[PDB]
Amino acid sequence: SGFRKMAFPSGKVEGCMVQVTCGTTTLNGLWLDDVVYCPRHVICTSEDMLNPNYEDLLIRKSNHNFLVQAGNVQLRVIGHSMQNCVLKLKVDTANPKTPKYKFVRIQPGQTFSVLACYNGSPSGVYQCAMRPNFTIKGSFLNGSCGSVGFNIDYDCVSFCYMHHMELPTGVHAGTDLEGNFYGPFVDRQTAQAAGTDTTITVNVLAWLYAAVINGDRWFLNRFTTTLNDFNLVAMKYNYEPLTQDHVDILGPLSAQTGIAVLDMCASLKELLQNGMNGRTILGSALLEDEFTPFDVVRQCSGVT
Amino acid sequence: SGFRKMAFPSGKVEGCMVQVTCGTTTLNGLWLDDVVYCPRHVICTSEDMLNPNYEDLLIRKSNHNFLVQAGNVQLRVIGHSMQNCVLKLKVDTANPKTPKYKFVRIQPGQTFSVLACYNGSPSGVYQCAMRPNFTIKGSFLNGSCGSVGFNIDYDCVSFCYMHHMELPTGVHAGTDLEGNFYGPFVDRQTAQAAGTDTTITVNVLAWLYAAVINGDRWFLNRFTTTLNDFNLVAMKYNYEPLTQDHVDILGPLSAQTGIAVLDMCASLKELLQNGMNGRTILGSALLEDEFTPFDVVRQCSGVT
Numbered sequence A, B: 001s002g003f004r005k006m007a008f009p010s011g012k013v014e015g016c017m018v019q020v021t022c023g024t025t026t027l028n029g030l031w032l033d034d035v036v037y038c039p040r041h042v043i044c045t046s047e048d049m050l051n052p053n054y055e056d057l058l059i060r061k062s063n064h065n066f067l068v069q070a071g072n073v074q075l076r077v078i079g080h081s082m083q084n085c086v087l088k089l090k091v092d093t094a095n096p097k098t099p100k101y102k103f104v105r106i107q108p109g110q111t112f113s114v115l116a117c118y119n120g121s122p123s124g125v126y127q128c129a130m131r132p133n134f135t136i137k138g139s140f141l142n143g144s145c146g147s148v149g150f151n152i153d154y155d156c157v158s159f160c161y162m163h164h165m166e167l168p169t170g171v172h173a174g175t176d177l178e179g180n181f182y183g184p185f186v187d188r189q190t191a192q193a194a195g196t197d198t199t200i201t202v203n204v205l206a207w208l209y210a211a212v213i214n215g216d217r218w219f220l221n222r223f224t225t226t227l228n229d230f231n232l233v234a235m236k237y238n239y240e241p242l243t244q245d246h247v248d249i250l251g252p253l254s255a256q257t258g259i260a261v262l263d264m265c266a267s268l269k270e271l272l273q274n275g276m277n278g279r280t281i282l283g284s285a286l287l288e289d290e291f292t293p294f295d296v297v298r299q300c301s302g303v304t
């Protein structure tokens, strides 16, 4: 019973967080095997961050200029290199707590857990969606950069996100662990536009199925629709167009509940056109789009 | 920037979760030093759970009848005892991963992290408030009982909650780690009433301060009020009465923002009387009461 925004257990990832310091700048690094990964802007003074030439800034830096601290202890840096927007610091000690892991570039609409860190210490854990405009709605202060996003598949950690910055809308942008930004963002202090924040339609539908599984069914109506008809209404509300692959992804939830995907679409259409009329679904007064179909199945079946 | 419902990092607690089996019934236990704590209803068959005589049921049980599994390995049970609604199984091995810990009976309106577990394995982590009616709004299926709620204060884990059951409203009830239920609940299969779900007024105010700190200030109005005047409007909306101790608790947030507590109260009063008019605060369309003032300070100051 009940449906909550739920992070993965963070223990495997807590054991990989270190502190990386250059000059005055301290942020978080991810220690996997004998490599520490961190945002390249660790090398920047406050002057530099307006229009930094990272190649020129890095050339002034040697191995000994990077202080890497794993709790109590100082790691010895024996090599450094820049890959896109991340620094790879080679250290003389393999992290003995290195979990089984992969680096994955996650797709828009997929979710992951953020372990928010400061000075290489965990602050807290929460779920985020990689939004269609390649932003996330996180909670990040100064010193949070290098905090990572991950998924767990049994014992394997899939790292998909490293935190680099805030946009003027109060949303967040970062890189995969190869240092390639999600979306059109760059690591300098300029006003940067994410575009239209489109709603993840397949996730809203997944969450309406979550609501029906959990006994909230007041919004189920007597109508059906077509993909082309629904999409006309999606377009108006800045919803992602629903496609046959999305209908296929929702098939197991459609089956478990006996509500056809296009019947749920008709329900969604009436909610978009009529609002909630002061009513709530799973204790929310708006349509939630940060649960994937997998998140709904995982949570409603107790996957561990 | 940004404000999220954020759990503590779960690593210290992941290391204390075990599986406890009696007959057909498997649930979660908490392994601290040489003791495993679990819900006493582990001893019940499905027949028993209607009107169980736990004293009589337990008398038929010996040490060897309790299977305790720490991942791969079987723990040897060398003693068992019932304390209120929890079983204490003495095992021949101290948990080598036992963190510094305390057991605390938490107050209504205070928050904690739930590590949702099945078969002694972590599923996920989320924040809950102990509600004024001593329920929580969690996500729990069959097999989740023995899952625990905790706070962390630097390196010390404060265990405050163990999960025992679901109420007909879809909310959850459990015990402290001494096995005393929060609220009027009993561990048997009967329809049980939590009463009126009163809103945690001091937490709503904390979250309105969170909103102002994060730049959401549209709801700030030109009026002030008095405690007695506000409370007249609180009463009508099933809000907890605001007291001088609550005003004192909000003092640091009032100071940091320069908004007097009674001015924020006047804002809240207009939101209760007028609703949101289709607007949102920190990405919510209703008033959130599951952040304590401490949760707001912790999150807005990067405590680790």
Ligand SMILES: *[C@H](O)[C@H](C[C@@H]1CCNC1=O)NC(=O)[C@@H]1[C@H]2CCC[C@H]2CN1C(=O)OCc1ccccc1
Pocket: A027, A041, A049, A140, A141, A142, A143, A144, A145, A146, A163, A164, A165, A166, A167, A168, A172, A186, A187, A188, A189, A190, A191, A192, B001
């Ligand atoms: C890294 O710890 C930091 C994370 C930020 C701090 C405040 N919330 C958050 O998420 N990242 C930055 O401070 C980056 C830094 C690296 C690349 C360039 C600098 C500036 N910056 C940033 O976040 O820019 C914010 C901004 C917003 C509007 C207009 C200009 C700049």
Ligand SMILES: *[C@H](O)[C@H](C[C@@H]1CCNC1=O)NC(=O)[C@@H]1[C@H]2CCC[C@H]2CN1C(=O)OCc1ccccc1
Pocket: A001, B027, B041, B049, B140, B141, B142, B143, B144, B145, B146, B163, B164, B165, B166, B167, B168, B172, B186, B187, B188, B189, B190, B191, B192
């Ligand atoms: C423990 O794993 C289980 C947790 C429940 C299962 C479904 N969601 C959830 O939180 N607890 C129970 O199943 C308990 C069990 C122990 C004490 C008595 C039995 C029955 N039960 C329970 O949760 O009662 C639910 C209920 C609801 C309405 C009317 C009658 C009974």
